[PDB]
Amino acid sequence: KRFEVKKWNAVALWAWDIVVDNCAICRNHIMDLCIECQANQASATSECTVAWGVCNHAFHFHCISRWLKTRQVCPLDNREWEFQ
Amino acid sequence: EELARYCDSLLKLEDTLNQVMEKFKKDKDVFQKFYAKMLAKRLVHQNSASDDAEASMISKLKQACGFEYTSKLQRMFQDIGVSKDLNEQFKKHLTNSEPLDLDFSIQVLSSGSWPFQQSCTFALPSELERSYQRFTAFYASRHSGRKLTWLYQLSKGELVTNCFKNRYTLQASTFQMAILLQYNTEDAYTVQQLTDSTQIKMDILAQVLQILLKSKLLVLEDENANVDEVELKPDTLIKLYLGYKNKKLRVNINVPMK
Amino acid sequence: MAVEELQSIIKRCQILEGLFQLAGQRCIEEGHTDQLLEIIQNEKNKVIIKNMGWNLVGPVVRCLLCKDKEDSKRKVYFLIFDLLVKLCNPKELLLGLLELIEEPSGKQISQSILLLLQPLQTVIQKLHNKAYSIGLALSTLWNQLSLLPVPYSKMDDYGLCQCCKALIEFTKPFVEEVIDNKENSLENEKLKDELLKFCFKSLKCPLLTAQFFDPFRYFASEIIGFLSAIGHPFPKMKQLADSMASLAYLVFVQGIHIDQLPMVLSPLYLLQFNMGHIEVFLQRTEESVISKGLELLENSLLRIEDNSLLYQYLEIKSFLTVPQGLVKVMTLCPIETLRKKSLAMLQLYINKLDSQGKYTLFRCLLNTSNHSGVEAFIIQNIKNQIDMSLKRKWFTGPQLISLLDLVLFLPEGAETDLLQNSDRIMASLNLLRYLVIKDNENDNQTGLWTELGNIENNFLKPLHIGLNMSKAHYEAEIKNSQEAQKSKDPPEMQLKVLHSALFTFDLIESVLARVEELIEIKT
Ligand SMILES: [Zn+2]
Ligand SMILES: [Zn+2]
């Protein structure tokens, strides 16, 4: 291989990330409507809801449900999932 | 202006410092801009004579013009130390895993206090990836909530060559490295192909090729072509020259652009 | 002995028409201050002490200053002081007093300023003629005074507050002078110039970092007051930009002298004038200064009705630069409250702008902010607009698409970093999720049906590609990190930092896998 990298001296700048209160799975403000339900004609199910698991990070029940039909776990950290 | 430059040209004892500090009293802000830049360069490039002396200069300015005048200064310094300890920790954290085949360092800077800006479009070379992948995920462990912005155009490295009659150490820009590395695939590349690959804005890429071409390593289809003149084009062909020779084994190809 | 020398130098120089200073220092230092006064009194000889004795001021003024005071010692010093201020030729005197410029620093500045302010008057009036003098004394005074830090809710150790009230007392007589004059004579002119010069100084340094309930209200009031007292009242009002932004804040936020200004009261009219000042506040790094800027923006913005703010207002610079300046502080500033606040102010701003104004500001912040988070925020907002933007536009047709090319554009798209690109991609993916759900193909008020194929090519697939490449790299780096670890015979926790990344991928995929499930299902 004609070119081999011996050293690399790199510069990087850091800034702060911005923080907002969001369903991480879909992204919509917690306290606000889950997105699929924002795109919905007003429905029975249209009254998704705040769910918390033991891990303490929180989701729209709507979103975390379809997350839990697939894996058994929590998406953010990784833990098998029980409510609170 | 030069009232500033003089200090960095001298600093590139504390007596000869104070001997400026008198002339300091004499529009100190536009001065502090320039002096900042001076310091910044003296920092990222390492060097800068005696560090304790730089600190004594700072703290000398501290009481003089008060807190906010200095503070960005102080932030650059402690940013440097912070980077030293960062690198230490990283070398220790990798110590249980497969090592990096290259020799890695990074200075991380507070985006706020440093003049440096805007990064550039760039495509990180695969050979450069794992280092990056590893350190990114490391910083995220030491600080959540932070974002890292890599400034390649200030990033330098060392290539080692296997295809020459002789083995060279090339001290190069990261744009240089990214270009050259492209030659482990093919022996000739059109400039277009090189922007579609290293993702380097053509405006920049041109000057960079011009440097490499000036360097022995790459060559045009036209041998009679003056590289200090001829204007490179999308379909222009850049060839690797295996005829390369140097009376130096470790050679630095990374040079002020003109 | 030094006394004898002093007398020898007197009788030597008392015929005619530097060491002299030295014998003064000595005589004053531990020993007799008595015979010094015994020399000056009897008022012989006036000519030297007139042309010379000002030299003795410094050692005296240190023997006042450096001395702890609280003494019946000092009054004998004060005597010879006053006697000096009385008998000395004025031109060379204040200069000595202006030695204060250098002489102290930090906490012990005030006591110098407080001590010599009166003599500075008595001298300056002695020469009626010069404004240039006052210019000098005010300049130097403000120089020294600018150095001391500005307190909040604090008794003050540095003496800044009493020094500002004291300055006001000093300055009044000079501004009460010009208020009444027959003549236009140039001395009056240059006196006005120097005066208001000092007013822009004080407007600038002390008041710009100052916080309010209030000695800084008294100071502001009294200075801007001086601005009315001379010509060019504040209402009419480079490098003065700091002074002017301080003034703007002082008037509009603190309501100081707000009465003189015309009623206005259309929040628009004030806004467009004030925006510039806000920008000048936000470019600053001080917490106090950033805070003030934010307050002025919020205040200006509170009054405006939602979606009033007209597109064409963005054709003023501050109107674009300021949201940017907000994005600056959100990301770059130490103080979290300020970051959270700045984010808020951004969202308020967006809210005020009319539809196309929003679209414009989005498009700008997308290609400007260069932060994947604030890009995700911008995406959110766009989704909100699209939603609202249908009942009976800018967020619907090819304009929307033009705006989509910007969000769904993949930088180095196949290989992008999805670790730090994770949030903007989550945003974009949810926005899609909405779009494919809301409108049918064959209804198609939105966007997409035309773009869908081109999207799945230029966004969706390469995102699959990227996810794959990524999970692969990360799994591998891990497994063989273990292989390395075991082959070497702290504890492997070091690896968890990687596991995190895997989650972030499996998150996205679950989202992506969902979108396509719809992309077919609703097709
Ligand atoms: Zn959700
Ligand atoms: Zn729902």
**Which residue is it, tokens 């053509």?**
B202
| B105 and B166 share one domain | yes
| Long-range contacts of B242-247, Cβ-Cβ distance < 8 Å, separation of 24 or more | B242/B163, B242/B164, B242/B165, B243/B216, B244/B161, B244/B164, B244/B165, B244/B168, B244/B216, B244/B217, B245/B165, B245/B166, B245/B216, B246/B166, B246/B168, B246/B216
**CA–centroid distance, residue A57 to ligand 2 (Å):** 18
Position C248, amino acid: A
Q: Do B114 and A13 touch (CB under 8 A)?
A: yes
Distance of CA C165 to the CA centre of its chain: 23
Residue C63 sits at φ, ψ, to 5 deg, of -70, -10
**What are the residues facing A80 on neighbouring strands?**
A73
If one counts every other C-beta atom within 10 angstroms of the C-beta of residue B15, the result is 6
Residue C284 tokens read as: 């600053």
Q: Last residue of a domain, which of B58, B80, B98? A: B98
Residue C115 tokens read as: 């001590």
Q: For chain B, what percentages of helix, strand and coil (3-state, to nearest 5) are there?
A: 50, 15, 35
Q: What is the DSSP letter of B110?
A: E
| B248 and B133 share one domain | yes
**CA–centroid distance, residue C17 to ligand 1 (Å):** 95
For residue B201, the SS3 value is coil
Distance of CA A25 to the CA centre of its chain: 3
Using a CB-CB distance cutoff of 8 angstroms, which residues of chain C are in contact with residue B63?
Answer: 105-106
User: Counting beta carbons within 10 angstroms of the beta carbon of residue A22, is it exposed (0 to 12), middle (13 to 18) or buried (19 or more)?
Assistant: buried
Length of chain B: 258
Q: Last residue of a domain, which of B43, B71, B98? A: B98
Domains: count for chain B: 2
Q: How many helices (H) and strands (E) does chain A have?
A: 2, 3
| B20 and B72 share one domain | yes
Q: Do C497 and B67 touch (CB under 8 A)?
A: no
Reported in sequence order, the residue ranges of B19-164 that DSSP labels E, i.e. its strands, are 103-110, 146-161
Closest CA to A14 of C223, C75, B246, C420: C420
| B104 and B211 share one domain | yes
Continuous segment of H or E residues that includes residue B132: helix B126-142
Closest CA to B70 of B39, B47, B98: B39
| B127 and B211 share one domain | yes
A14 interface with C at CB cutoff 8 Å: no
Residue B137 tokens read as: 């995920």
For residue C374, the SS3 value is helix
Residue C434 tokens read as: 């909405």
Using a CB-CB distance cutoff of 8 angstroms, which residues of chain B are in contact with residue C484?
Answer: 96-98
**CA–centroid distance, residue C307 to ligand 1 (Å):** 27
Q: What is the β-pairing status of strands A3-16 and B146-161?
A: antiparallel
Q: At B130, which CATH number?
A: 3.30.230.130
Q: How many helices (H) and strands (E) does chain B have?
A: 9, 7
Q: Do A35 and C339 touch (CB under 8 A)?
A: no
| B69 and B112 share one domain | no
Dist CA C395 CA C359 (whole Å): 7
Dist CA C384 CA A27 (whole Å): 12
User: Counting beta carbons within 10 angstroms of the beta carbon of residue C258, is it exposed (0 to 12), middle (13 to 18) or buried (19 or more)?
Assistant: exposed
User: Counting beta carbons within 10 angstroms of the beta carbon of residue A61, is it exposed (0 to 12), middle (13 to 18) or buried (19 or more)?
Assistant: middle
Q: What is the β-pairing status of strands B237-240 and B218-219?
A: antiparallel
Determination technique used: X-ray
Residue C36 tokens read as: 């010094």
Give the torsion sign (CA, C89, C91, C92, C97).
Answer: positive
Closest CA to B171 of B211, B220, B205, B132: B211
State in Å, rounded, how far the first CA of chain C is from the last one. 110
Residue C314 tokens read as: 């963005």
| B217 and B190 share one domain | yes
Residues whose CB falls within 8 Å of the CB of residue C111, separated by 6 or more in sequence, listed in order: C65, C104, C159
A63 has binding-site annotation? yes
**What are the residues facing A51 on neighbouring strands?**
A59
C330 interface with A at CB cutoff 8 Å: yes
Residues whose CB falls within 8 Å of the CB of residue B106, separated by 6 or more in sequence, listed in order: A9, A10, A11, A12, B83, B86, B87, B90, B135
Closest CA to C210 of C164, C142, C277: C164
Distance from CA of C330 to the nearest CA of A (A): 7
Q: What is the DSSP letter of B149?
A: E
State in Å, rounded, how far the first CA of chain A is from the last one. 57
Best mutation site among A3, A18, A20, A77 for testing chain B: the one with the most B CBs within 10 Å? A3
| B159 and B46 share one domain | no
Residue C25 tokens read as: 């220092």
Q: Do C484 and B138 touch (CB under 8 A)?
A: no
Cβ–Cβ under 8 Å, residues C37 and C79: yes
If one counts every other C-beta atom within 10 angstroms of the C-beta of residue B211, the result is 22
Dist CA A46 CA C447 (whole Å): 25
Task: Find the ligand nearest to A51 CA.
Answer: 1
Measured between CA atoms, the residue of chain B closest to residue C501 is B137
In order, the DSSP letters of A8-35 are EEEEEEEEEPP---B-SSS-SBTTS--H
Cβ–Cβ under 8 Å, residues C137 and C195: no
Q: What is the DSSP letter of C395?
A: T
Q: Do A18 and C331 touch (CB under 8 A)?
A: yes
Residue C259 sits at φ, ψ, to 5 deg, of -65, -40
State in Å, rounded, how far the first CA of chain B is from the last one. 24
Q: Which of residues 111-170 of B touch C (CB under 8 A)?
A: 111-112, 118-119, 121, 123-124, 129-130, 133-134, 136-138, 140-141, 147-149
Cβ–Cβ under 8 Å, residues C352 and C309: yes
**CA–centroid distance, residue B141 to ligand 1 (Å):** 26
CA separation, residue C103 to residues C58, C96, C109, C206, C209 (Å): 10, 11, 8, 21, 25
Q: Do C497 and B112 touch (CB under 8 A)?
A: no
Cβ–Cβ under 8 Å, residues C226 and C192: no
Find the helix packing angle between C496-521 and C422-438, rounded to 10°.
20
| B151 and B89 share one domain | no
| B45 and B149 share one domain | no
C504 interface with A at CB cutoff 8 Å: no
**CA–centroid distance, residue A21 to ligand 1 (Å):** 11
Cβ–Cβ under 8 Å, residues C376 and C427: yes
Distance from CA of C498 to the nearest CA of B (A): 6
Q: Last residue of a domain, which of B98, B120, B154? A: B98
User: Whole domain around residue B151: which residue ranges?
Assistant: 99-258
**What are the residues facing B223 on neighbouring strands?**
none
A32 has binding-site annotation? no
Cβ–Cβ under 8 Å, residues B130 and B94: no
Domains of chain A plus CATH, in order, are: 1-84 (3.30.40.10)
| B240 and B114 share one domain | yes
| B93 and B140 share one domain | no
Q: What is the DSSP letter of C31?
A: S
**Which residue is it, tokens 């960095």?**
B8
Closest CA to C252 of C186, C294, C296: C296
Q: Do C477 and B134 touch (CB under 8 A)?
A: yes
Cβ–Cβ under 8 Å, residues B31 and B21: no
The data reach a resolution, in angstroms, of 3.0
Task: Find the ligand nearest to A63 CA.
Answer: 1
Q: Which stretches within C127-240 are classed as H helix?
A: 131-147, 160-179, 186-209, 215-229
Cβ–Cβ under 8 Å, residues C206 and C145: yes
Cβ–Cβ under 8 Å, residues C211 and C288: yes
For residue B151, the SS3 value is strand
Q: Do B147 and C372 touch (CB under 8 A)?
A: yes
| 3-class DSSP string for C97-134 | HHHHHCCCCHHHHHHHHHHHHHHHHHHHHHCCCCHHHH
Residue B33 tokens read as: 């801009």
Measured between CA atoms, the residue of chain C closest to residue B199 is C412
Q: At B23, which CATH number?
A: 1.20.1310.10
Cβ–Cβ under 8 Å, residues B150 and C507: no
**CA–centroid distance, residue A48 to ligand 1 (Å):** 9
